[PDB]
Design an enzyme around this catalytic site. Structure first.
Site, PDB file in Angstrom:
ATOM      1  N   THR A 105       0.893  -1.110   0.004  1.00 11.71           N
ATOM      2  CA  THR A 105       0.025  -0.059  -0.013  1.00 11.71           C
ATOM      3  C   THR A 105       0.692   1.031  -0.054  1.00 11.71           C
ATOM      4  OG1 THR A 105      -1.635   1.134   0.932  1.00 11.71           O
ATOM      5  CG2 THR A 105      -0.249   0.200   2.537  1.00 11.71           C
ATOM      6  N   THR A 106       0.282   2.470  -0.129  1.00 14.52           N
ATOM      7  CA  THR A 106       0.737   3.621  -0.161  1.00 14.52           C
ATOM      8  C   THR A 106      -0.123   4.737   0.401  1.00 14.52           C
ATOM      9  OG1 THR A 106       2.506   5.207  -0.885  1.00 14.52           O
ATOM     10  CG2 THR A 106       0.570   4.277  -2.607  1.00 14.52           C
TER      11      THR A 106
END
Lengths: 227, 203, 227, 227, 227, 227, 203, 203, 203
Positions: B1-2
């Site tokens: 994720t980011t």
């Protein structure tokens, strides 16, 4: 006859302390509320008689959620403690289920809390009465609470010193579906007819909700137009 | 994720991707990692999904109870302090999560909180698997003299580079700008696609 | 009629013990406070009658934080215990949230503490009354506390033996926005008019805050200029 | 009127049991103390009337620390228990902070201990009164303790059967800065004027401290020189 | 003679508080129920006298399961609390065994709960009476509950203010195997003969089950056909 | 004289509450039992007076094991609770030791349970009396239980309203070794002579065991042959 | 990270760097590790971020409660004793931190406290990853006959050498001098840059 | 094992296989993994058998108690939130299970919940050992413009491919379609065999 | 060890071997693994001896208490549910056992329960060390159109093959048939030897 000391049954089947709490909430501030066409209001008489009281900062209409509000009557300390219990209980249901789907569940938990101190010895009952108002998934609801923990659902109800006079006016003159302006006008006429025995009313405090939006408490200027 | 969060002049911008996995095996092409936590601040998610959602529920509850008991919004330093105390009351049964909260009360802030409860101010921060890429592009292109449109274009370019060069991130970007004037607003996805087609990052 | 022994409801809806605590705080030291233009003061009459008492070391204006102070009246032991509870509660909020953002939260927790011993049997209520003063994020606030746990917010209030005489003078002669010098002068005139029935006042003790700085308690020399 | 049984508030706002404890400590042994130029003393009348009592081994001046001492009056059993509580509390502060920096903290914890049994039912108050003396970082301090838990700071005070007579002599004849010899002489004259109603005094027991050194309790021979 | 205060045995072997609870449930709303050929019904008189009461939303016939229902009489708060206890107990048996095999087990656990506050001091008895109805594996069952916790099984029973008048009519005119229509007609005639002393009945609320299907509570329109 | 309120000793050495429980069990249903040649029976009078009572489903002879049964008299709620305690205690001994080797152990544990609420304050005694019957490894046993927890072993005993009349008939006319048919005939004659003062008996309920097999409760048809 | 604390004649000087990591990956170029703990003493941080911040919050709370209950500041030996008791009440769920508290009550002190709660006096102390470098330069150049300006120049040279030769430390140095006369004062960053450009340690 | 859940226009379809093992050693050729949890929503099972059955019992109990206390069915987001809170209250003695709940209240939903309590919306989801196969065929053939018959044919083709290419799954497929109009209905096995013989997937 | 349980038309047959070991070292040539749990249902044992006997004692107690409090026998689904809840209340101090309960209430059932508390219906089931052999022969020869004699002959052939091809099982077979008409009856060993000599499986 038997005990006026602590909550036990009498020969006539009467909980004396819970009675004495009901006359304690009869000695309080009058306040009322009613449903209108797509929501519900709550109006409280304001207990301002000194000019030193910080008029607007003393609120008897208090919020429990952004989608449940409450106005109280009776002992003000028991009122504040019970209202805070209702606040954290609503927050518990927000944590557990994700939303406050029934306002009736919220009044029932608070009413059970009052029933316990009606039930046990070593403690007096909560000498306080409240009405709850707001919309849920079902729609607009208006409740009442009793020192025994009795709840009843209304279209319009009262509480306080002007319980009976207001409830007589509401019993005569209430119309079920009503636009908000005429609703708050009818509510003020109710509050007038009772509280105009000291030949003054004042500016009261009054809040409202319509289905589909959040809470709105009036300001000082808006209520005097309907006054 | 980011994740990403950028403080500029009188507003703060946060955005995430939406791809949740929950195995190696990307499993949900449209999750939800950005959360409005209050009327003037929000929160992002970059850790374990269940623990993160429970933290979001608890913080929503505590801030709403706060706003109702005191009738004022909570300061951002206060909510970071509360979150840090909550995470550090239990660290030997810890939450495997990286949090990032931003908002504005009298001045915009964005705070980073690790799994151990270390809160620290910064003007731009990011978490997640593809986080070093967006730190690279933010270090290269960021200026504090930007406007809101320049900022959100920078954010979209950042998350676009992260989706291009990271396996775990991906999916449709969503962005919400929070300012003092207009409050919390999440951009519609049509505007986001318009900015992507304007910047020329679509394939 | 019913029990003057322990806190239960009466036939007239009255908690007798909480009454008896109110007449206990009527037997105490007089003290008062008022807001001024950008802050608030607290003045206490000093209960010095022996020359053996270490005059300045007995303080009835006590600090709860660097940004909340308190002066008390009633039973002095219950006063000290309750003030220490307020101190550690303010410290709890400093630990949890990082700062003391609302002084109203601080008076409400202490008032809940007093409500409990109003509520339960096996124990008497706190026979003590306090006023809290200080600035928060909202601004200058001045509260009051009651043996039931009732709180009210004032621009100016009193407590103690000279409750009523002082409150009558304040009811007549208070001006809302007032520079600090004329404010402490008005407060001393209030304390005079009541306490000058033993035909003496003494040097009182008096503290002040303005928004944006910390606490300042006067010394012995400064108060006699305004005396 | 209401209860002389257990600690509740009265119609006149009076805790009857804490009163009854005060007349219990009026029935006790007289003892007093005063500050001098660079320290403080404590003198107790000795309750020796039998020759079978091991005269010197019965001590009413008891040490709490090497830098706080205490002499007591009232019920002797409650005295011993409370003094031991004070001892272990001073030891707690030594463990926690490293030293006993304020003797006022030490009297306040003991006074809170007495306030609790003033506060709760199911138990009577401590029928005992004490005075504490010693130097701390601030300097020489002299306290008093009351069955309610009331503390007051003195330059000179008394306790016991000769409370009032001694306090009248101290009220007339005390000088603030005084060398140790003339101080113990003034204290003995005080103890004389009261206790010389049975037309005898005896050798009293008396201790002293100066700032910068530890405790010194006199022996039997030294006190008779000042007698 | 002995105590009318709290539940102890008398010289005539009588629990006075449990008596006083029985006269408390005599002061309540009348309600009744009876078995028919392949099921059982429950009808309650409705305590509607204000037009402000939300007529249909106040339900005294409440569901415990999809296969056990209950109508109550007595103190309405104790009613609500006890009914919720019955609900969660039925859910416990669903968790543990997989199904609600005996409705008699469910009434017995609730009756034990009432026996406890019949048994202990420091609590009054539950001043409430209920009847339970539903089918189990055995078939249609109709129970009763008593403030002592006494249960009895009926083919037809009553509760409330019209206990005795209704039970006299049922004692005369009940037929064991009866189609549902004539059953609810007989039940309404019972409710009539008693409650037609205020010369009105109203629309009552009434539910039914047949073996092999779930619960059906009537609507407002259907009951007036049988009225 | 002293307390008829709660269980303490009197000046005549009498536990008044346990007395009052004995007159409470004198107000109950009559029931009896006796040993025969190779087993024991239990017969209860049936408290049926309404036709609405589900005659056979109300059982006062209740099983504790397949090898211990019980019939009760007194307060029916305390009866049910105590019988359930006996059931789970028998199950505990089945878990621990593998079988119910002594029925005397089972009556002794229940009797200790009743002794406790005879012993402590804050609670009334169990106002109930029971007789236990069954075979163990020793053989046929017949016990009795008393509100104090007193147990006695019989060859034949009674309980209830017809305690004394039945026990007089048994005292005259009992034969030790007796075939089952003549045994139940003698038992019915006993139940007759007492209960035939309302000039009716009814069909009673009656169970039996012989050594070496399980329990048999009669049906409605079989008892009328011996009637 | 790195810290430093130096006792001289009538004052005590403490300074830290500001770079927080919170991964390998230096993450926050401007943290906060120096904390005013009371009006005449302060505290530095050289351990795990969350645990350290919770310790700072607790010690601020306890010293303010102290000063209000007793109306006098706490002795430095007393605050070190309290901190040692707090750290040694729990050592099998320990705080991974190295603390350093300095201040003046009647004489300047600076105390070092390890993770196990060992308090010990010294006249100059340091903690952190780059701590041996500043111990080297303090051992080489330190004199107790210095002035305040000479002392703070020594401190800046020390932390400059630590930033030059250590990976973990870095970022902008901040310094606060605490004396009995003027109380706790933190130097503005413009004065710090002026001293750096005067000493010739900038690049 | 394998599960599947598909949201379409005004209905949601769930189906599982029935083969329980409970060793390597396939042991029960006809289990039960699909459970009606309420009159308008159901639940599937893809984990440890005992823990899963206890979870099914508890959720049946809580939803029935809910419906009786409030006289309305629970929202699907609410039941997923409740399940997530239950699973995340204990994660260090965790339930080794993958859950999937679907239903309709005002709009159809199907939610996936892992062992750690991560709830996430999706329009089609699957769990179990043979789950990537049905994700492949659903990604290849799925359209949201389908009818109920086209949807259930897609489901049968999916689980057929999973039985063809997975060891753990197998046995007779059962399917239940839940819509707002007709409520929860489980298809009879004769109709399922008819659809299999129509699609030509039988051998 | 080995167990077997077979449901046929209006009866259910269970049988075990009797050889308990309790070391490698076969130790007891005549144990007891089949237990009548109630007047219309029974239970077998295939795990750790002590834990299994405690479970048998507890279930005898609970079912007898049940039958006395309610005056009806317990359903087989209910007793399996109760056993599953008991085993799954403690699984991190688990019972190393494989249980198999069968009986008839209105229809014959036989349920298998693992150590983790997974209850599942089946028409024929088996547990124990030599269980795959009897699953093989039951899969090969079983029909649901059998009589009671054909069923018990199938059972004896099954356990005979298991004793022939397994080390752990052995000893004299005992068998109990439970039907609705005659209740629980255990076959005498003389009849069992007669059936063995009839089928020709003795050596």
């Amino acid at each position: 006859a038997y005990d006026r000391a602590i909550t036990v049954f009498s020969p006539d089947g009467r909980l004396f302390q819970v009675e004495y709490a009901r006359e304690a909430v009869k000695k309080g501030s009058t306040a009322l509320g009613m449903k209108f066409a797509n929501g519900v209001l709550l109006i409280s008489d304001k207990k301002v008689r000194s000019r030193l009281i910080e008029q607007n900062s003393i609120e008897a209409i208090q919020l429990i959620d952004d989608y449940v509000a409450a106005v109280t009557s009776g002992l003000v300390a028991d009122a504040r403690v019970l209202v805070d219990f209702a606040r954290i209980s609503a927050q518990q249901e927000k944590v557990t289920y994700g939303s406050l789907v029934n306002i009736e569940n919220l009044v029932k938990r608070v009413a059970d809390q009052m029933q316990q101190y009606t039930q046990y010895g070593g403690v007096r009952p909560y000498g306080v009465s409240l009405i709850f108002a707001g919309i849920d998934q079902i729609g607009p609801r208006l409740f009442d609470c009793d020192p025994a923990g009795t709840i009843n659902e209304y279209k319009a109800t009262a509480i306080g010193s002007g319980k009976d006079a207001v409830v007589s006016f509401l019993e005569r003159e209430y119309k079920e579906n009503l636009p908000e302006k005429e609703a708050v006008t009818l509510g003020i006429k109710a509050l007038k007819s009772s509280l105009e025995e000291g030949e003054e009313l004042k500016a009261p405090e009054i809040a409202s909700i319509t289905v589909g939006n959040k809470y709105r408490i009036y300001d000082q200027e808006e209520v005097k137009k309907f006054l | 994720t980011t994740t990403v969060g950028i403080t500029l002049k009188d507003a703060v911008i946060m955005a995430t991707e939406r791809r949740v996995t929950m195995e190696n095996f990307i499993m949900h092409k449209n999750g939800k990692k950005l959360f409005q936590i209050d009327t003037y601040t929000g929160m992002t998610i970059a850790g374990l999904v269940g623990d993160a959602q429970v933290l979001v529920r608890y913080m929503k509850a505590e801030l709403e109870l706060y706003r109702l008991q005191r009738r004022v919004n909570m300061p951002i330093e206060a909510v970071a302090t509360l979150l840090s105390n909550m995470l550090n009351q239990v660290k030997y049964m810890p939450y495997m999560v990286q949090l990032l909260v931003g908002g504005i009360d009298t001045a915009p802030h964005v705070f980073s909180i690790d799994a151990a409860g270390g809160s620290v101010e910064d003007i731009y921060a990011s978490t997640g698997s593809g986080s070093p890429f967006v730190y690279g592009v933010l270090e290269s292109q960021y200026s504090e003299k930007m406007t809101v449109d320049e900022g959100v274009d920078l954010v979209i370019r950042a998350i676009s580079a992260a989706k291009q060069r990271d396996s775990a991130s991906g999916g449709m970007i969503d962005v919400a700008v929070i300012t003092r004037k207009d409050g919390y607003v999440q951009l519609p996805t049509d505007q986001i696609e318009s900015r992507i087609r304007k910047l020329g990052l679509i394939l």
